[model samples]
Target: RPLPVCPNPLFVRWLTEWRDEAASRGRHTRFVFQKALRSLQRYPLPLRSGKEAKILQHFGDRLCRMLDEKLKQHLASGGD
Candidate 1:
């Protein structure tokens, strides 16, 4: 299966902003962009009806849940 895609408009907007900022600061390389995108796939997005909304919501929720889980796990593991 294809890797999951992010569907949150707000998230997309934020990602674009981050990319632009990185580029302006000369930190936006291929690795940087990829890393940023990968890192972004960890937020919660609200759900809606239909294909567009489902896709967006799915990714948003996935990221959100992932982030929550990761944070919890990190803390539980005695993160410093």
Candidate 2:
């Protein structure tokens, strides 16, 4: 299937430049984004239809709560 083009050229250019900069700095940009992107598979914000938005929001709220707990654990483990 053909990939859809983004309507915003500025965003496209920014993304390209960001990726290039990260690569030059030896950062694992793709790996970081891939892990973050994978989490969104369950509640992608692009699902903007009213019904889809509600569902996604609900799931996102739940996910955020879980993330908060995990972050607390992480910080606590670091003695902070």
Candidate 3:
């Protein structure tokens, strides 16, 4: 696969945290994070909003909402 920069840098990091967090929770939840991680790792596109991130295979409303909260923070923190 070709390499490209990820558009949602903050969101990606959030996935990492949530993935590891789920590790202590259960393998099932961790697997969801794992799938989502790889999908976006080579997504080769831009995300307009995390709310609409369900476009990806592994992203659900659960993760989308989590992403949206952080995304809001990402915008409110500084220049968008």
Candidate 4:
């Protein structure tokens, strides 16, 4: 099947890199990345706030924090 349309390309790119690294990390690590990939596939791009992160399974504090930071940077840098 085709990959889900990621709302935030940059975040997805970061996740892809994380997934790649997970291969060398461990099976559990890779599974977490896989969960993140699935969860992020449904994320609303241009994430409005950290509030949206609570609804996801794999999107915990770290992921949410990263999203918050990246979202801010993405907007600040005029990334689209």
Candidate 5:
């Protein structure tokens, strides 16, 4: 059985960025992005904190902090 769903648009978009990042680099790296997307998609609620985002699988310290930085960038750039 699976979990729930959350929009997690920021995370989703960010993951997609890196997915193609791997989607371009190679298949091996894409595993992290794809797996991260799976967990992000399974989220049942909106997220505000990177540490909270870290609560999801594959969203470890590095990934969570990356999201923190990414969100920071988005906050300043209108996040489009």
Candidate 6:
């Protein structure tokens, strides 16, 4: 399948790195990474804050926080 296109370059880079690391860890980790990737692909750019992140099966607080921070920074720098 074609890779999902993410509007946010920062998020794309972060997810790619995470996925690569996860790929080397073992099958379960790889599965988690794939699920997370699929979730990201489904959701696509500009993840909303609060309950949206909390409710996603693969989106824990840490991942949500990272995404929030990156998104905020990107917006602050006038990213589109």
**TM-score against native, each model:** 0.30, 0.29, 0.65, 0.54, 0.74, 0.49
Q: lDDT of model 2 at residue 72?
A: 59
Q: List model 3 lDDT by residue over 35-79, tens digit each.
A: 777777778665557755777757777777777777887789874
lDDT tens string, model 6, 3-48?
5544543554556667787777654555555665567667755555
| Candidate 1 per-residue C-alpha lDDT over 13-50 given as tens digits, one digit per residue, 9 for 90 to 100 | 43455568767787634344444345445535432222
lDDT of 6: 0.61
User: lDDT at 22 for candidate 1?
Assistant: 68
Q: Rank the candidates by lDDT, best first.
A: 5, 3, 4, 6, 1, 2
lDDT of 2 by residue, 1-80 (tens): 14553232122232344456777787665444333334344432443222332343433543334444544565679732
For model 1, the stretches where C-alpha displacement exceeds 4 angstroms are 1-8, 28-80
- Collision count for each candidate, in order: 5, 0, 0, 0, 0, 0
In model 4, pairs of residues that clash are: none
List model 4 lDDT by residue over 2-74, tens digit each: 6654456555666677778778775455666567667767656544555676467586777767766887887
| TM-score comparison, 4 vs 6, better candidate | 4
Regarding TM-score, does 5 or 6 come out ahead? 5
lDDT of 5 by residue, 1-80 (tens): 13434446577777887788788777675777777778777777666668787877676677778777878888899955
| Maximum-TM-score candidate | 5
Sorted on TM-score, highest at the top, how do the candidates line up?
Answer: 5, 3, 4, 6, 1, 2
